[PDB]
Amino acid sequence: PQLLHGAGICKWFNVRMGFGFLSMTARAGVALDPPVDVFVHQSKLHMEGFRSLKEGEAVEFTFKKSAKGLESIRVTGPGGVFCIGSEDRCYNCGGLDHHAKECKLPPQPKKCHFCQSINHMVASCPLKAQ
Amino acid sequence: PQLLHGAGICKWFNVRMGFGFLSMTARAGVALDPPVDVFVHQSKLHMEGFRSLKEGEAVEFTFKKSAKGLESIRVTGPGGVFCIGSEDRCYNCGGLDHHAKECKLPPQPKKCHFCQSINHMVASCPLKAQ
RNA sequence: GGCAGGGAUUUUGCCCGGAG
RNA sequence: GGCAGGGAUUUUGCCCGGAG
Ligand SMILES: [Zn+2]
Ligand SMILES: [Zn+2]
Ligand SMILES: [Zn+2]
Ligand SMILES: [Zn+2]
Numbered sequence: 001p002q003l004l005h006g007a008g009i010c011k012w013f014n015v016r017m018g019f020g021f022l023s024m025t026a027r028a029g030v031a032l033d034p035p036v037d038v039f040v041h042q043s044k045l046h047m048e049g050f051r052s053l054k055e056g057e058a059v060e061f062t063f064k065k066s067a068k069g070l071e072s073i074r075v076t077g078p079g080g081v082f083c084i085g086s087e088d089r090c091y092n093c094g095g096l097d098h099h100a101k102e103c104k105l106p107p108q109p110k111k112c113h114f115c116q117s118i119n120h121m122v123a124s125c126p127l128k129a130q
Numbered sequence: 131p132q133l134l135h136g137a138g139i140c141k142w143f144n145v146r147m148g149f150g151f152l153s154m155t156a157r158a159g160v161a162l163d164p165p166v167d168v169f170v171h172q173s174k175l176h177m178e179g180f181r182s183l184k185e186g187e188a189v190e191f192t193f194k195k196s197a198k199g200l201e202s203i204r205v206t207g208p209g210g211v212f213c214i215g216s217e218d219r220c221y222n223c224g225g226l227d228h229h230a231k232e233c234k235l236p237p238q239p240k241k242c243h244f245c246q247s248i249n250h251m252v253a254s255c256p257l258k259a260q
Numbered sequence: 261g262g263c264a265g266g267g268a269u270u271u272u273g274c275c276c277g278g279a280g
Numbered sequence: 281g282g283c284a285g286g287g288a289u290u291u292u293g294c295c296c297g298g299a300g
Contacts, residue, residue, distance in 0.1 A: 011290075012291060014286090014290070016284095016285090017286055020291090054291090070288095086292080091280080144271065146265090151269055169269085221298080240298070253296060
């Protein structure tokens with residue numbers, strides 16, 4: 001197993017530095033306690049325009065072992081949706097050009113308006129509570 | 131002299147608390163050193179919609195003596211322009227409905243895009259450099 | 261994303277889900 | 281307001297003025 005499916009949240013991200021880390025809470029579908037850190041480089045972020053991540057945002061991804069540690073290959077939001085980033089987007093896909101009613105993609109589960117988590121909604125967001 | 135003209139910047143403002151203080155740098159036109167604190171209540175701010183002030187924003191106002199100290203009566207930006215506040219507006223008047231080209235008001239001097247100071251421009255803003 | 265209203269010294273509380 | 285590109289552990293640098 002060289003290519004593995006990961007899911008967690010953004011641990012931290014330095015936008016100027018172009019990198020950060022992900023806190024991997026589930027590896028290959030199985031839950032992780034304590035979470036394991038996975039490196040992210042801006043170039044591997046599925047986003048429209050300028051790439052970045054925001055601390056705590058929900059990510060799903062694929063990763064591999066590297067000489068420096070664990071390296072993510074492609075980083076998306078839950079369900080392959082675009083990431084949020086830092087410094088108005090479709091409720092279904094995160095796309096900037098349109099709204100959920102005009103979305104060409106298959107319907108996706110409701111994601112937290114703040115962090116994109118599929119587990120809660122904005123009104124009960126732990127990240128927002130900061 | 132009951133009713134006085136003052137000018138300075140906002141010292142601090144607590145939006146939930148509905149009040150703050152102004153750091154008056156010029157009383158009745160004459161320069162003050164050290165500056166003197168003047169109380170502001172949200173109800174006295176010349177603004178469209180939700181009233182607040184942001185630390186350091188340029189402010190022009192009228193004040194009076196009160197049992198508790200100095201109390202501002204009406205608070206505007208330099209030249210009677212709307213205040214900025216906290217949490218798009220015309221470059222000439224601070225109005226939300228339009229842009230400088232369509233402004234019906236007489237031309238006002240250029241104000242810092244960040245703090246509304248008439249003395250500098252955003253690219254050299256001390257407040258922004260924080 | 262939306263909505264506001266604790267008057268005397270320090271940086272804001274609340275509400276939102278198959279749709280803006 | 282605008283523009284981006286420092287690959288391995290911590291939250292971003294730059295540029296903008298009689299006009300968006
Ligand atoms: Zn969409
Ligand atoms: Zn959330
Ligand atoms: Zn105007
Ligand atoms: Zn300024």
